[PDB]
A paper describes a structure:
Here, we present a high-resolution structure of another VR1 protein, OLPVR1, at 1.4 Å resolution. Type A rhombic crystals were grown at pH 8.0 using the monopalmitolein (MP) host lipid matrix and have the P21212 space group with one protein molecule in the asymmetric unit. Type A and type B crystals resulted in the obtaining of the OLPVR1 structures at the resolution of 1.4 and 1.6 Å, respectively. OLPVR1 molecules are nearly identical in both structures (root mean square deviation (RMSD) less than 0.2 Å), so hereafter, we refer to the structure from type A crystals as it has the highest resolution. The OLPVR1 protein (residues 2–223), all-trans retinal (ATR) covalently bound to K204 (K257 in CrChR28), 9 lipid molecules, and 107 water molecules are clearly resolved in the electron density maps. 2Fo–Fc electron density maps at 1.4 Å reveal two alternative conformations of the retinal in the region of the β-ionone ring. At the same time, the configuration near the Schiff base in both of them is all-trans 15-anti. Strikingly different from other rhodopsins, the intracellular parts of TM6 and TM7 helices of OLPVR1 are significantly moved apart from each other far enough to form a pore. The pore is located at about 8 Å from the cytoplasmic side of the lipid membrane border and connects the inside of the protein with the groove on its surface, which leads further to the intracellular bulk. Surprisingly, in our structure, the groove and a part of the pore are occupied with a fragment of the lipid molecule, a host lipid of the crystallization matrix (MP and MO in case of 1.4 and 1.6 Å structures, respectively), which is likely to be a crystallization artifact and is discussed in more details in the Supplementary Notes.
Phylogenetic analysis shows that, within the rhodopsin superfamily, viral rhodopsins form a monophyletic family that consists of two distinct groups, VR1 and VR2. Here we present the results of a comprehensive structure-function study of two homologous proteins (61% sequence similarity) from the VR1 group, OLPVR1 (ADX06642.1), and VirChR1 (TARA-146-SRF-0.22-3-C376786_1). In this work, we demonstrate that VR1 rhodopsins are Na+/K+ selective light-gated ion channels that are inhibited by divalent cations. VirChR1s have proteorhodopsin-like architecture with short extracellular loops and share several structural features, such as membrane-associated ICL2 helix and an unconventional TM6-TM7 orientation.
Author numbering: 2 to 224
């Protein structure tokens, strides 16, 4: 019953986060802060895919007859590249001397951003092969972890600066994504409970963070 309970907890946070995010879109922004709204729009698009998966899950769990963990990959293969792009946009926001927008970043860096998303795709493909038992768990863990490390290395060396604001955002995200790999080791129920709660942290906490940064930047404009 704890897969269902953790799914409901995840859905609860998704709904409240979506409401917060929509109000966030309409907060007026100073010039330098425009990219924060570009990030929040993409986080809301991630939420649409996440929500469709979670409604599918709670309906499916009524009559589970097979191990449905692999179905998460149809969400992740869409959401995780968008989340890596929004992370790049947020690092560029933090670290850039004057105003920066996603078009400037995309137009400049599309090849490198492709590399990041291709590394991430290989991580997911290896996970999917392990989840569907087309390769053994040990090969899945080692190959998946290799591409997780490559993704986060490529992100670090291009987009971070050496300060504690950067270390918090980078290492929080790295640890949370690593813990999806940790979950892979566990039996059906425990693994799926872990994913249900991890999604709150990887997706919804990120949205709430961006909302609070917008509110902080814009508070004086609002009042």
């Amino acid at each position: 019953d704890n897969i269902i309970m953790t799914a409901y907890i995840s859905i609860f946070v998704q709904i409240i986060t979506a409401i917060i995010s929509v109000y966030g879109l309409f907060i007026p922004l100073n010039f330098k802060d425009i990219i924060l709204r570009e990030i929040l729009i993409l986080e809301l698009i991630v939420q649409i895919i996440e929500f469709i998966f979670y409604i599918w899950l709670i309906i499916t769990l009524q009559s589970i007859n097979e191990d449905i963990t692999y179905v998460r990959y149809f969400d992740w293969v869409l959401t995780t590249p968008v989340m890596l792009l929004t992370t790049v946009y947020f690092f560029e926001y933090m670290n850039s001397d004057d105003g920066i927008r996603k078009k400037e970043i995309n137009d400049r860096d599309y090849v490198y951003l492709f590399y990041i998303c291709l590394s991430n795709f290989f991580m997911l493909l290896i996970g999917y092969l392990g989840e569907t038992k087309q390769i053994n768990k040990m090969l899945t863990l080692f190959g998946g972890s290799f591409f997780l490390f490559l993704t986060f290395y490529l992100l670090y060396v291009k987009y971070t600066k050496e300060n504690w604001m950067n270390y918090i955002v980078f290492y929080f995200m790295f640890l949370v994504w690593f813990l999806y790999g940790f979950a892979f080791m566990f039996p059906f129920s425990i693994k799926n409970q872990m994913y249900n709660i991890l999604d709150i942290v990887s997706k919804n906490i990120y949205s709430i963070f961006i909302f609070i940064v917008i509110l902080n930047q814009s508070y004086k404009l609002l009042l």
